[PDB]
Design a protein around this ligand. Structure first.
Ligand SMILES: [Zn+2]
Lengths: 136, 126, 429, 90, 175, 50, 121
């Protein structure tokens, strides 16, 4: 016949952030029983005020920058076509949705919770003998 | 705790909304709707071609509270339960009853229109 | 087999000069070697009263420090383990060091004017620092026993509650009643960085060689581990319900809810211990939020007050009815808890008059009683373990400070046979 | 005065230098004025000031602290060879 | 628009609502209620959509465990009300008690909400490490014990401000 | 505007003491009765109509 | 039959004394039996914490006679000493009181305890 034999980056690309739904992991953090590395109090808040406190996504993505800056000893900056969205549309996602540093933008979503889990999604017990071994 | 007319039930059927499930859409909080004893005496008195309203009125989530009156007339049973306490929230769609309650201060009136219900004198709409 | 994980090793292969930055666990297992039955127990009677803390410098001569509510930093020697501790120098405070303004930022008087609470010796031996309710951290030169630097805490509520040095490095961590944790360099005498987060006053802090400290609030029932540089922290909550204990025991005593977490010692990097007021010594683990082993009342129940005292009524059978039997009873608090680092052994001290020393199990999932040191009596506040000798066979000297009161206030009944002074005890092998 | 903490002390013998991230603590002052660090980062070592090079100081917000990157060379004549010209002029 | 105007702009009651909420809590205008009331209407419509849905449906299970736990941490919902029947009932006074105007005043330090408003906007009160000077700050639950005067503040432990330091220098040269 | 909100509510809390008799404080003094006076014929009580 | 009735549970001892500690810092706590007596006369007390282990039990037992006259709730806690550290006082306070103050940050928390006191009555 014919076969492509083509290498793919997208199949090796991580898709963890696509199905990652935030309210599902908030159950995880209570049921993990590991500690979770909360920062200090005044180390959170943004500009003496105006910018709402910190998202826990925000102390993650800013941590990703500091982990990147300490490796390469250099800084990244005001590069404009990315900044005009990702500072406008992101800091308005704060004031529209975050309240006291905790996100309430989850709850107005049409992204439904089922489509991540979906009765384990793939590798599903579609036959009868598959159902006996999950009982095993 | 919301009082209910005959008329609010009748236009609830024509506009395809549940009472309890449909009130919570307008009101956004939990509510305990409660038909008085005078109002149930009207719904029976409306007769045969309103009996599907009389089935929907007697629902165990719809509460009932008695009254001490000598009469059926619930348009004036209701305002008298409102002046003496002012904790209730009247659900009517009678034209004369709305005018009877819009003069009373601080009583959230509630009517049915179009798809869902509407409230008037609640300050805490949203 | 990964791409970046090889690259992570290559970059970290070149990484250099991390000694205290690298973690160390429990490796020292002399807990079965110790003999507590025949271990000698020597007590001393000092003239001052209401002793508060002991810290002891140990070289890489041995030494001892005491501080008492007579406001007296006192300079001692213990370097011979066969004799009682000996006076070298002292420095009593007083009321001549009361500040002039009494309200300003400045509190720069050289001496303590009211109620010291805690002491700690710098691990180089060059300095020693005292703290208290006078909201002044005064570091003292050891030799002439003079105030070398006085540090105002710059807050009206900032009374000092505990002092904690890093091992072999003079980074000084200090706990304060205003929900603050001040951190200090001592060689440069400068304020490092301020940590925040307890809902209650911070009664105890301890450290190791690493840049981490563990602090406890009193009533909040939380113990917090810290990163000093990244300024992040952990949260360790207790919360053992008695109804989960009682219905566990209904498948077949008393159980107590936890009023406070008072003291804490850090045994290694991944585990530590905390004392409570309901006699709990909880072994904690960094992987878990719940304690990895709870051991209920250590020193036992507090002695029940007498039947004649509580009623004030001449009918004798009526006196026992008011007591309500088991309901009135209380435990001993845990007012002292310290482990020699990286070891299987820690000591608990209270006013039951028995320094109940515990052995950590080698799997580090529970601990177990070693023995008791019954020579002391009355309220015990602090514990410093000082070792000597060769590598394998080590002579020790537990030192504990005994007061008739607690560090922080009276809160005490029917203390008896208790003298102010140092309890010394040498355990061999 | 000032107090300095060093994190990730990484040695690069290709350029024959000690790299580290510098964690500068400002107890009350305003800032640290990099010439004063090139003084103080020298005398924590043997460096004879101009074999150190500090550049990446962005402050902790609200003051109190600043974080950046320090380059400590060996053999001070090498500082003319591997540093850029805009750090020679500083 | 971060805030929606109500369907009834001018009633007899809605005007006498916003007299009181601005009166007791010391608000600047009519706008600062509607920023609160719009965000609350997001949360309350979310809670009704979780009660349209059956129990053991995971969207009611997980997001319900999220929303209640999220409202504990901002201190609006008390911890004992750990059910979705209570997150409906919270009115807009529950958010305004968590503002820094009232939470300074109700902690002390003020003598009045309007005096607590002035202490915020002049940078005296501090929330943990960072000094905070916006009064609608919405203090979380864990942050509540920590509200205190700044160390660089003359009501705290610092030097006096200019109007004492000018007067203290004035009495020296006068005398 | 934050003053006119203050000086309205502080003005519209005096009116509230005049429309109804709003609760205030408790009784912290010593004295028992009333300063403004008793009327015999008022009956400020909501009567339950039939 | 016992004179120190009602005595609180161990779990309720925690929830009471923790509310006492914040009311100590907010200055709504008035400390001492002779001071808690006065707030019952002024009518401004919320509820009354009493120590069961103080000797005698009758030196403070006038308060439930004074509280039930005025419908003010009251409890017994087992230790005067553990009420001391909740009080922030160097000496054991054997009787405390929570004053009614409307500018109370702990107002939603006091009424959680107060409702768990009337449960005992
Ligand atoms: Zn009727």
């Amino acid at each position: 016949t014919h076969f492509e034999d083509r290498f793919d980056a997208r199949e090796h690309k991580d898709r963890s952030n696509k199905s990652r739904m935030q309210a599902m992991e908030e159950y995880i953090r209570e049921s993990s029983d590991q500690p979770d590395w909360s920062a200090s109090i005044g180390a959170d808040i943004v500009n003496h005020g105006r910018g709402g406190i910190k998202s826990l996504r925000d102390t993650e993505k800013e941590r990703r920058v500091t982990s990147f800056e300490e490796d390469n000893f250099t800084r990244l900056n005001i590069t404009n076509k990315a900044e005009k969205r990702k500072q406008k549309q992101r800091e308005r996602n704060a004031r529209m949705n975050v309240i006291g540093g905790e996100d309430f933008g989850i709850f107005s979503s049409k992204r439904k919770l089922e489509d991540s889990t979906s009765r384990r999604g793939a590798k599903k017990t579609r036959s009868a003998w598959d159902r006996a071994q999950r009982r095993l | 705790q919301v009082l209910i007319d005959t008329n609010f039930i009748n236009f609830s059927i024509q506009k395809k909304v549940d009472i309890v499930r449909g009130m919570m859409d307008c009101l956004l909080a939990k509510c305990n709707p409660l038909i008085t004893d005078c109002v149930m005496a009207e719904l029976e008195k409306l007769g045969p071609k309103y009996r599907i309203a009389l089935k929907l009125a007697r629902d165990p989530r719809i509460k009932r509270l008695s009254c001490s009156h000598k009469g059926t007339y619930a348009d004036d049973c209701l305002v008298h339960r409102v002046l003496q306490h002012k904790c209730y929230i009247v659900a009517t769609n009678d034209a004369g009853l709305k005018q009877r309650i819009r003069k009373i201060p601080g009583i959230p009136l509630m009517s049915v229109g179009g798809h869902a219900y509407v409230i008037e004198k609640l300050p805490d709409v949203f | 087999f990964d791409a970046g994980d090889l690259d992570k090793d290559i970059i970290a292969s070149r990484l250099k000069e991390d000694v205290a930055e690298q973690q160390g666990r429990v490796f020292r297992y002399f807990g079965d070697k110790l003999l507590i039955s025949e271990a000698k127990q020597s007590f001393t009677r000092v003239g001052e009263n209401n002793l508060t803390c002991i810290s002891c410098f140990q070289p890489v001569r041995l030494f001892a420090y005491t501080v008492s509510k007579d406001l007296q930093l006192t300079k001692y020697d213990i370097t011979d383990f066969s004799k009682r501790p000996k006076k070298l120098k002292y420095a009593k405070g007083g009321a001549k060091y009361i500040p002039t303004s009494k309200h300003e930022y400045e509190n720069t008087t050289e001496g303590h004017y009211d109620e010291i609470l805690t002491v700690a010796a710098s691990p180089d031996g060059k300095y020693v620092v005292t703290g208290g309710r006078d909201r002044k951290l005064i570091v003292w030169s050891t030799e002439s026993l003079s105030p070398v630097k006085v540090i105002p805490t710059k807050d009206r509520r900032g009374e000092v509650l505990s002092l904690a040095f890093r091992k072999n490095s003079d980074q000084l961590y200090a706990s304060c009643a205003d929900f603050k944790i001040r951190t200090y360099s001592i060689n440069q005498f400068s304020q490092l960085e301020i940590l925040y987060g307890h809902h209650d006053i911070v009664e105890d802090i301890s450290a190791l060689a690493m840049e981490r400290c563990v602090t406890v609030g009193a009533r909040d029932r939380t113990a917090m581990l810290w990163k000093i540089p990244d300024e992040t922290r952990l949260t360790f909550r207790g919360g053992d319900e008695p109804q989960k204990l009682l219905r566990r025991w209904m498948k077949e005593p008393l159980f107590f809810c936890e009023g406070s977490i008072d003291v804490v010692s850090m045994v290694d990097d991944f585990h530590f211990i905390t004392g409570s007021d309901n006699g709990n010594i909880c072994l904690w683990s960094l992987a878990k939020k719940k304690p990895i082993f709870t051991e209920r009342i250590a020193h036992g129940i507090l002695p029940e007050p007498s039947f004649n005292d509580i009623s004030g009524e001449t009918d004798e059978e009526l006196r026992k009815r008011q007591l309500q039997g088991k309901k009135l009873l209380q435990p001993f608090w845990i007012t002292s808890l310290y482990a020699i680092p990286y070891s299987n052994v820690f000591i608990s001290g209270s006013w039951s008059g028995s320094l109940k020393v515990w052995k950590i199990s080698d799997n580090l999932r529970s601990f177990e009683l070693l023995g008791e040191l019954s020579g002391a009596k009355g309220v015990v506040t602090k514990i410093q373990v000082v070792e000597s000798g060769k590598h394998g066979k080590e002579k020790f000297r537990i030192l504990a400070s005994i007061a008739k009161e607690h560090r922080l206030g009276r809160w005490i009944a029917n203390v008896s046979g208790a003298r102010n002074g140092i309890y010394s005890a040498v355990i061999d092998q | 005065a000032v107090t300095i903490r060093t994190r990730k002390v990484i040695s690069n013998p290709l350029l024959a230098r000690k790299q580290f991230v510098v964690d500068v603590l400002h107890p009350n002052r305003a800032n640290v004025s990099k010439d004063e660090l090139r003084e103080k980062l020298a005398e924590v070592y043997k460096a004879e000031k101009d074999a150190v090079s500090v550049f990446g100081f962005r402050t902790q917000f609200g003051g109190g602290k600043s974080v950046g990157f320090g380059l400590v060379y060996n053999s001070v004549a090498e500082a003319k060879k591997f540093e850029p010209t805009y750090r020679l002029v500083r | 628009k971060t805030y929606s105007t109500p369907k009834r702009p001018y009633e007899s009651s809605r005007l006498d609502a916003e007299l009181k909420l601005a009166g007791e809590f010391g608000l600047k205008n009519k706008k600062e209620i509607y920023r609160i009331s719009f965000q609350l209407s997001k949360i309350r419509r979310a809670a009704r959509d979780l009660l349209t849905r059956d129990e053991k449906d995971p969207k009611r299970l997980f997001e319900g465990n999220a929303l209640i736990r999220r409202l504990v941490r901002v201190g609006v919902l008390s911890e004992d009300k750990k059910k979705l029947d209570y997150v409906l009932a919270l009115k807009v006074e529950d958010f305004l008690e968590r503002r820094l105007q009232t939470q300074v005043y109700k902690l002390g330090l003020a003598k009045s909400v309007h005096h607590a408003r002035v202490l915020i906007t002049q940078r005296h009160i501090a929330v943990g490490k960072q000094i905070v000077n916006i009064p609608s700050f919405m203090v979380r639950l864990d942050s509540e014990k920590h509200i205190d005067f700044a160390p660089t503040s003359p009501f705290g432990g610092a030097r006096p401000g200019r109007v004492a330091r000018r007067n203290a220098a004035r009495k020296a040269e006068a005398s | 505007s934050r003053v006119k909100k203050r000086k309205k509510y502080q003005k519209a809390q005096k009116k509230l003491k005049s429309v109804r008799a709003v609760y205030s404080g408790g009784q912290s003094g010593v004295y028992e009765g009333e300063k403004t006076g008793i009327k015999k014929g008022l009956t400020r009580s909501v009567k339950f109509k039939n | 039959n016992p004179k120190a009735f009602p005595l609180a549970d161990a779990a309720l001892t925690q929830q009471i004394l923790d509310v006492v500690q914040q009311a100590a810092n907010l200055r709504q706590l008035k400390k001492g039996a002779n001071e808690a007596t006065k707030t019952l006369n002024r009518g401004i007390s919320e509820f009354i914490i009493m120590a069961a282990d103080c000797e005698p039990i009758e030196i403070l037992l006038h308060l439930p006679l004074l509280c039930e006259d005025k419908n003010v709730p009251y409890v017994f806690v087992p230790s005067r000493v553990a009420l001391g550290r909740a009080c922030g006082v160097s000496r054991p306070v054997i009787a405390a009181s929570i004053t009614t103050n409307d500018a109370s940050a702990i107002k939603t928390q006091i009424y959680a305890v107060k409702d768990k006191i009337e449960t005992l009555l």
